[PDB]
Design a protein around this ligand. Structure first.
Ligand SMILES: O=C(O)Cc1ccc(-c2ccccc2)cc1
Ligand SMILES: *Cc1c(COP(=O)(O)O)cnc(C)c1O
Ligand SMILES: *Cc1c(COP(=O)(O)O)cnc(C)c1O
Ligand SMILES: [Ca+2]
Ligand SMILES: [Ca+2]
Ligand SMILES: [Ca+2]
Ligand SMILES: [Mg+2]
Ligand code: NA
Ligand code: NA
Ligand code: NA
Lengths: 323, 323
């Protein structure tokens, strides 16, 4: 039916378990006091590499083949330089293969340093997509690598879904999961998993209003990507949903809550100050969603809500400017 | 025998357990790798009020009596706007009694607003130690209230010992606890508990070399308070050890590690960046200790080390200074 099944998610958990952390679920009286609800925080900010993306990245390295004639990937390649590129590089290191990040010439110096810091090799392209694609596909071919998309690659989606296997085990009375959405790999993997195992549990997406393609797509009933690059502090969810994640999200996600920039900022600072968790603002999106006006429409029967705190890769020394 | 015994800790546990968090113990691969040990982090930064001090404060509020006909305090009175005062204020809220803080009339508006935000009631004094004391005495008496010493009060020391009761359950094979020391209520409480329950477990203290009264005292075999108020980023450990905590520390604490300001800063930053925990610098003291050169020479038999992350009440709009 969909591009992954529950079986794929389980195969992913088996593939990655020896190398990832089974992150804790933490609680906060204050947040419980504030939102009306009984909250549980799945702490993917404590995951290896600082975000959940190691799950999909490692599953991809351990399950994808470069070619019909070669079973083992000989390198990994991606155009993502953020949490995905960091995760993929780490996954590549674990498997003893090189990682290449295709970066435009126009990338900030700090981004070029940060990539080299996490142990990947840089391959430069032009700012353009024609060049970007040329280069990545060319690097993939010449290194006998796998190209690993941050959110549309089935093995990546299946890996992200393992979060939900853990949550359902860690929080047996959970009523809903709240998941920040960008490309929807995490949302789709989680939705597949929850709906296979216990479909009475709600799956809710949380999204910046400033980048609201998932909302608009669900509203319209077809895939409606952002027409232009979004401006948002939630830097990890600037991707649009894509052709592999959209059908899952359409069919299996119960609702989508959008949140303003100010809501994202206030929820992030609330988590910092009141929970002492260094989440990145992108991980504040799910917290903002549960605090938002529209979340009050959620039935009072939906009491036990697990929010995925998806990452903690925040640049305290530079990024911080909005505080 | 001392101003408390383990019996007092068991009592405090029963007194307070229904109202405080049984904080988690977290781990970090990177910090294991940096120290060569198996580290366990007791997360008192997640405790109510943002530090462990609610333990001693609540125990004191639930066990001390006013100078009045009624056996229950009708108020709490403090000089502290810091971790101590915030802890006492929350304890008062739990008991449905007012918490008053005595504040010089020349306090900045920012401080006063900050004080009122956590729910304390300000009573003004003149800016002298004479006026501060006299106002606090008057308010305590007129309100049929109590005052609670931050580190020498037996009820506080006993409540602090409940940290170790949890650690010994959460980390059954623990070989040592590392505890930041100021007035030493937390250190003494912990030492009593550990030496009563599992005396083969080491109890190590950690303090800034800029405020090294605990180290000097243990070296000399007598209480040698700091000669002047120390300068340190570790605001919460500026107090010297006192007459009630010293005998316990003398007899029951195995060793004292001192750490420089730079070590404290670097340990605190390492915890933010690599563990995503927003500890205050005072809580970085214990981390700094386990990373320090002197600690590296500790016997390899002392493998499983629990560090108390004592607090997370850090001024976020003020971090820039040392970063
Ligand atoms: O202001 C505070 O909360 C700290 C504090 C509390 C009690 C005492 C005290 C000193 C001597 C005898 C009795 C109490 C000192 C300081
Ligand atoms: C990638 C990422 C997300 C969004 O995941 P998608 O699969 O792209 O929807 C959310 N939070 C963080 C921290 C991320 O790195
Ligand atoms: C009070 C405090 C300490 C020191 O406890 P003492 O009993 O005074 O030695 C350490 N860390 C934090 C965060 C504190 O608030
Ligand atoms: Ca290929
Ligand atoms: Ca979006
Ligand atoms: Ca000291
Ligand atoms: Mg498809
Ligand atoms: Na593991
Ligand atoms: Na695939
Ligand atoms: Na499960």
């Amino acid at each position: 039916q969909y591009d992954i099944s529950f079986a794929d998610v389980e195969k992913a958990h088996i593939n990655i378990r020896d190398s990832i952390h089974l992150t804790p679920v933490l609680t906060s009286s204050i947040l419980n006091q504030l939102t009306g609800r009984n909250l549980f925080f799945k702490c993917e900010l404590f995951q290896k590499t600082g975000s959940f993306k190691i799950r999909g990245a490692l599953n991809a390295v351990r399950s994808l083949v470069p070619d019909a004639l070669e079973r083992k990937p000989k390198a990994v390649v991606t155009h993502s330089s953020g949490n995905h590129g960091q995760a993929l590089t780490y996954a590549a290191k674990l498997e003893g293969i090189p990682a290449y990040i295709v970066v435009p010439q126009t990338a900030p110096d700090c981004k070029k340093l940060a990539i080299q810091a996490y142990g990947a090799s840089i391959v430069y392209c032009e700012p353009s997509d024609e060049s970007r694609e040329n280069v990545a596909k060319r690097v993939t071919e010449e290194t006998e690598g796998i190209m690993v998309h941050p959110n549309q690659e089935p093995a990546v989606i299946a890996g992200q879904g393992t979060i939900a296997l853990e949550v359902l085990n860690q929080v047996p009375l959970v009523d809903a999961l709240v998941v920040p959405v960008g490309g929807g790999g995490m949302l789709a993997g989680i939705a597949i998993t929850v709906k296979a195992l216990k479909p009475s549990v709600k799956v809710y997406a949380a999204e910046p209003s400033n980048a609201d393609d998932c909302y608009q797509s669900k509203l319209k009933g077809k895939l409606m990507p952002n027409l232009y690059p979004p401006e948002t502090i939630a830097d990890g969810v600037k991707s649009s949903i894509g052709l592999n994640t959209w059908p899952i999200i359409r069919d299996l996600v119960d609702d989508i809550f959008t949140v303003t920039e100010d809501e994202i900022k206030c929820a992030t600072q609330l988590v910092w100050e009141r929970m002492k968790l260094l989440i990145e603002p992108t991980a504040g999106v799910g917290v903002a969603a549960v605090l938002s006006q529209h979340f009050q429409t959620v039935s009072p029967e939906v009491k036990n809500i697990c929010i995925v705190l998806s990452g903690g890769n925040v640049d305290l020394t530079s990024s911080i400017t909005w505080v």
